[PDB]
Scaffold this motif. Structure first.
Motif, PDB file in Angstrom:
ATOM      1  N   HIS A  60     -37.492-138.280 -18.522  1.00  0.00           N
ATOM      2  CA  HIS A  60     -37.972-137.024 -17.934  1.00  0.00           C
ATOM      3  C   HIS A  60     -37.265-135.823 -18.592  1.00  0.00           C
ATOM      4  O   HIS A  60     -37.886-134.810 -18.916  1.00  0.00           O
ATOM      5  CB  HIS A  60     -37.658-137.046 -16.441  1.00  0.00           C
ATOM      6  N   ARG A  61     -35.967-135.971 -18.770  1.00  0.00           N
ATOM      7  CA  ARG A  61     -35.089-134.958 -19.373  1.00  0.00           C
ATOM      8  C   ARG A  61     -35.270-134.822 -20.914  1.00  0.00           C
ATOM      9  O   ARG A  61     -34.767-133.891 -21.520  1.00  0.00           O
ATOM     10  CB  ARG A  61     -33.627-135.332 -19.021  1.00  0.00           C
TER      11      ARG A  61
ATOM     12  N   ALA B 228     -33.881-140.789 -17.323  1.00  0.00           N
ATOM     13  CA  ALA B 228     -33.479-139.988 -18.483  1.00  0.00           C
ATOM     14  C   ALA B 228     -34.650-139.466 -19.325  1.00  0.00           C
ATOM     15  O   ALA B 228     -34.572-138.376 -19.883  1.00  0.00           O
ATOM     16  CB  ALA B 228     -32.612-140.862 -19.396  1.00  0.00           C
TER      17      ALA B 228
ATOM     18  N   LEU C 244     -37.731-126.650 -18.841  1.00  0.00           N
ATOM     19  CA  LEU C 244     -37.448-127.607 -17.758  1.00  0.00           C
ATOM     20  C   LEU C 244     -38.696-128.394 -17.349  1.00  0.00           C
ATOM     21  O   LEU C 244     -39.577-127.827 -16.702  1.00  0.00           O
ATOM     22  CB  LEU C 244     -36.990-126.757 -16.554  1.00  0.00           C
ATOM     23  N   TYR C 245     -38.783-129.702 -17.662  1.00  0.00           N
ATOM     24  CA  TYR C 245     -39.962-130.497 -17.223  1.00  0.00           C
ATOM     25  C   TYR C 245     -39.673-130.931 -15.778  1.00  0.00           C
ATOM     26  O   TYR C 245     -38.973-130.175 -15.118  1.00  0.00           O
ATOM     27  CB  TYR C 245     -40.217-131.676 -18.192  1.00  0.00           C
ATOM     28  N   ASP C 246     -40.155-132.116 -15.306  1.00  0.00           N
ATOM     29  CA  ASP C 246     -39.873-132.609 -13.927  1.00  0.00           C
ATOM     30  C   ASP C 246     -41.021-133.489 -13.367  1.00  0.00           C
ATOM     31  O   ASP C 246     -41.669-133.108 -12.398  1.00  0.00           O
ATOM     32  CB  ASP C 246     -39.526-131.456 -12.917  1.00  0.00           C
TER      33      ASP C 246
ATOM     34  N   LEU D  67     -30.910-138.278 -11.972  1.00  0.00           N
ATOM     35  CA  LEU D  67     -31.622-137.194 -12.604  1.00  0.00           C
ATOM     36  C   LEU D  67     -30.790-135.935 -12.663  1.00  0.00           C
ATOM     37  O   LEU D  67     -30.839-135.220 -13.651  1.00  0.00           O
ATOM     38  CB  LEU D  67     -32.918-136.897 -11.823  1.00  0.00           C
TER      39      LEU D  67
ATOM     40  N   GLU E 298     -38.294-131.911 -22.093  1.00  0.00           N
ATOM     41  CA  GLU E 298     -37.781-130.549 -21.870  1.00  0.00           C
ATOM     42  C   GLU E 298     -36.881-130.215 -23.069  1.00  0.00           C
ATOM     43  O   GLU E 298     -37.071-129.200 -23.738  1.00  0.00           O
ATOM     44  CB  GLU E 298     -37.096-130.358 -20.489  1.00  0.00           C
TER      45      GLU E 298
ATOM     46  N   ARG F 240     -29.804-134.664 -16.100  1.00  0.00           N
ATOM     47  CA  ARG F 240     -30.578-133.458 -16.417  1.00  0.00           C
ATOM     48  C   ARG F 240     -29.678-132.254 -16.746  1.00  0.00           C
ATOM     49  O   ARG F 240     -30.114-131.334 -17.429  1.00  0.00           O
ATOM     50  CB  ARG F 240     -31.604-133.153 -15.293  1.00  0.00           C
ATOM     51  N   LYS F 241     -28.402-132.257 -16.317  1.00  0.00           N
ATOM     52  CA  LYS F 241     -27.487-131.126 -16.652  1.00  0.00           C
ATOM     53  C   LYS F 241     -26.686-131.459 -17.918  1.00  0.00           C
ATOM     54  O   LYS F 241     -25.865-130.655 -18.356  1.00  0.00           O
ATOM     55  CB  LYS F 241     -26.552-130.801 -15.453  1.00  0.00           C
ATOM     56  N   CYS F 242     -26.931-132.633 -18.522  1.00  0.00           N
ATOM     57  CA  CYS F 242     -26.218-133.015 -19.757  1.00  0.00           C
ATOM     58  C   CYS F 242     -26.202-131.836 -20.735  1.00  0.00           C
ATOM     59  O   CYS F 242     -25.146-131.422 -21.214  1.00  0.00           O
ATOM     60  CB  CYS F 242     -26.909-134.217 -20.412  1.00  0.00           C
ATOM     61  N   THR F 243     -27.389-131.266 -20.968  1.00  0.00           N
ATOM     62  CA  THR F 243     -27.550-130.082 -21.828  1.00  0.00           C
ATOM     63  C   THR F 243     -27.690-130.414 -23.324  1.00  0.00           C
ATOM     64  O   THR F 243     -28.077-129.539 -24.101  1.00  0.00           O
ATOM     65  CB  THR F 243     -26.366-129.092 -21.605  1.00  0.00           C
TER      66      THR F 243
END
Length: 73
Positions: A44-45, A42, A54-56, A7, A48, A11-14
């Protein structure tokens, strides 16, 4: 190999179009049995990114819509 690495790293892929580029990489250096991690994680990301915050942790409900949401303090 906990989901933290999955995650966070993802999640920092952007970028969405990028998320693809990496995923194909993970494809052989990881493993099918494992890929659930990358798929289940993935997503989850994605919601957002669909907006820009930002989800989560999301219900299966969203991935059918990927639009609904709500503001909050």
């Amino acid at each position: 190999g906990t989901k933290t690495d999955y995650l966070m790293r993802l999640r920092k892929c952007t970028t969405i179009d990028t998320l693809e580029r990496v995923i194909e990489k993970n494809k052989y250096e990881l493993s099918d049995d494992e890929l659930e991690l990358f798929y289940s994680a993935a997503d989850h990301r994605l919601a957002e990114l669909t907006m820009n915050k930002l989800y989560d942790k999301i219900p299966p409900t969203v991935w059918q819509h990927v639009k609904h949401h709500h503001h909050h303090h």
